[PDB]
Amino acid sequence: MHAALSTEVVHLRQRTEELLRCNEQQAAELETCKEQLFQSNMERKELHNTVMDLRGNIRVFCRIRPPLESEENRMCCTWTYHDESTVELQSIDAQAKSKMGQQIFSFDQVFHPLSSQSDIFEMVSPLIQSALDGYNICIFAYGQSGSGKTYTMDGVPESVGVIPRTVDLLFDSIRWEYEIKATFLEIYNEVLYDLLSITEETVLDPNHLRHLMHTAKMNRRSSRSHAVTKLELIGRHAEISVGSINLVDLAGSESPNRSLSELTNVILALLQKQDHIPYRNSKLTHLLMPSLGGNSKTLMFINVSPFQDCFQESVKSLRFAASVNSCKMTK
Amino acid sequence: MHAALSTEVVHLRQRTEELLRCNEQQAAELETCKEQLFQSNMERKELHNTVMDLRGNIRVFCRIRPPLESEENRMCCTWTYHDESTVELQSIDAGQQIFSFDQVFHPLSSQSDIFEMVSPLIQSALDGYNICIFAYGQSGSGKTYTMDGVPESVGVIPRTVDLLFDSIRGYRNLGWEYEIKATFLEIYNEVLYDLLSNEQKDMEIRMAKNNKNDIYVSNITEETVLDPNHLRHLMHTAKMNSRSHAVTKLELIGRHAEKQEISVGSINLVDLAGSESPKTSNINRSLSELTNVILALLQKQDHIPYRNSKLTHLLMPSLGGNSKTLMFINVSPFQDCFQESVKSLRFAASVNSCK
Ligand SMILES: Nc1ncnc2c1ncn2[C@@H]1O[C@H](COP(=O)(O)OP(=O)(O)O)[C@@H](O)[C@H]1O
Ligand SMILES: Nc1ncnc2c1ncn2[C@@H]1O[C@H](COP(=O)(O)OP(=O)(O)O)[C@@H](O)[C@H]1O
Ligand SMILES: [Mg+2]
Ligand SMILES: [Mg+2]
């Protein structure tokens, strides 16, 4: 019995130890693997930005939101992702899939419904920073109501969002003298509201802005209005670099008041009709003019719903998103 | 005590079991992380190649060298750098001379400046692309100092290698193992010469083994670099060995055991012979043949006569397709080199002339 037991003890001891060093071996590799994956991710993004710049074409991002717990029984259409920038959608009924069929679109980046509010911002960040270095950055969220425009731009108190993570980046990148001119307005019928037509107030502290913004979001079928938000920056250091971080939140061009229809006519003009562009044919287009044409980095979000009942609309959205990413921004 | 050993056996089993599961869980993590790293690297390579395409798959640069300390008063012609792409020159003792490049390096541009144009292509070579770094110009323009450089200021090749080993080291953290095939040769009068041997012989350019498109130089010395010391040794052995072309080829062969993937690319650092006009008591063919192959590639042609010159045949698998080429046109900042400097630069005109 002694011998036998002895044999076990020895065996298990070697196994325990040989198995222990193996655990360390992996941990070392796991640790290293993360670092490398992290370095790889960082590279792709730097390169993804270099690429989008040299291209010139206004950046277009697709964001596909996940279904809310409420609509737990709401049918979804088939979604295929060919890679980081190409997304396809197919209807539940095959009688439409054969007749024209091939609903595949390719943008600068497609966000899966699992994407977080950070995975989004991390792609917008570069623009926000370039604002300080003297650049006019614009960014809106086209899409049908219920798609995610407001959730992307503003977001929810629980999580966050573009606009407000933007401030945490607008000040952090300052830590040279920087003066900021916050601005809020809205367009229901075709008139401007809030503190404007007239002006704004200056930013003082991150809290003051994080508040000034919350102040505006108050006083808000229901949302067929564009939510713009200007943010002029001032570079002194002591000739004065100036850049604005425009933030627009479109209404929704879903199957129907119709200002968005004039925005598309702009996009089309950004290619053909090089002669007179319908910039001055919409109160929205006018404020977004220094973005669609003039030297300015424009980033648009294309919010879409994964629901079948939204198919026709998703396609209209995706389809319009394609032409926009075709405009070669002068810059 | 049997009981004592008996109790240790149970606890050792509990420990082993609890250990087995910990390791198993780490395996699942590791595999996933490895799977994501490879894909992530695959997209990074794609993104990198896009940037190179955008900057141009065939770029031409100008590099004017500073006046030599061996002549304070030998004349310089009237230079005038219009932008960082255009440059002009003018004679003093006998239209307009204005040429555009992807970038113009003046006499103050350092070797690092030059390498900043190449550095990105080393990554391209490790990602399976074939690069061609060319140094065109008349004797004295600065071709050698550019490509090889000097010990006080190493040139393209030495920097390329240094970057190469560092990047190769890093890649091991992704599961990649890299090997470098080095070959050094000289082309004088359409005749190749091995710079790694003393034995006079014959080396013909035959088709590769795994591809009727790749090249193969029979009787060539193909060293498999063991480490930077080995390579260092070779490069020195080779320099020790005018009117010919010098070609230092680095073949980057990466292997990924786990994914069973390979990545084969190559850097072709060429030191073209002088482009001047000969006298009495030719190479200017393998040279014109080279510029034409680059011009032919630009105009996107079909029937390219690579096999025309010994050089264009050798670099054939690196002059077309995904391949990237940098043409550093060296120039002498002197009046007596006006005609030639204009000739050298004039090539840039033909390059961008391709609408
Ligand atoms: N990406 C997302 N992840 C989680 N929830 C989202 C996401 N996008 C939108 N939502 C939620 O979906 C609903 C519609 O979003 P919302 O921004 O109001 O659509 P829109 O503003 O385009 O009409 C809201 O209930 C919102 O809080
Ligand atoms: N950028 C430079 N800086 C300092 N010296 C240079 C530079 N370019 C060329 N030279 C020098 O000019 C001379 C010309 O030789 P080289 O560069 O090999 O010319 P080539 O290859 O065109 O025949 C060499 O002595 C070299 O060291
Ligand atoms: Mg809304
Ligand atoms: Mg030389």
Author numbering:
A (entry chain B): 292 to 466, 473 to 494, 517 to 539, 549 to 566, 570 to 587, 600 to 674
B (entry chain A): 292 to 385, 392 to 538, 551 to 590, 598 to 671
Q: How does the study describe this entry?
A:
Motor proteins of the kinesin family hydrolyze ATP and use the energy released by nucleotide hydrolysis to move along microtubules, performing essential roles in transport, division and other cellular processes. The kinesin-14 motors include Ncd, a motor that plays an essential role in spindle assembly in Drosophila oocytes and functions in the spindle and at the poles in early embryos. Structural studies revealed that Ncd differs from kinesin-1 in that the conserved motor domain or head is joined directly to the α-helical coiled-coil stalk, rather than containing a 'neck linker' between the head and stalk.
The NcdT436S mutant has a single amino acid change in the conserved nucleotide-binding P loop that causes the motor to release ADP and hydrolyze ATP faster than wild type, but move more slowly along microtubules in gliding assays, uncoupling ATP hydrolysis from force generation. NcdT436S was crystallized and the structure was solved to 2.8 Å. Remarkably, the model showed a large rotation of the α-helical coiled-coil stalk together with one of the two heads, resulting in asymmetry of the heads, resembling a previously reported crystal structure of NcdN600K. There is a difference in the position of at least one water molecule in the NcdT436S cleft that may explain the more rapid release of ADP by the mutant than wild type. The water molecule forms hydrogen bonds to the S436 hydroxyl group, ADP β-phosphate and G583 amide group, and is present in the head of chain A which rotates with the stalk, but is not visible in the head of chain B. Although density corresponding to the bound ADP and Mg+2 is visible in both NcdT436S heads, the density for the PO4-2 and Mg+2 groups is stronger in the head of chain A than chain B. The NcdT436S structure shows the C-terminal residues of chain B, which contains the head positioned to interact with the microtubule, docked onto the motor core, but the head undocked from the neck.
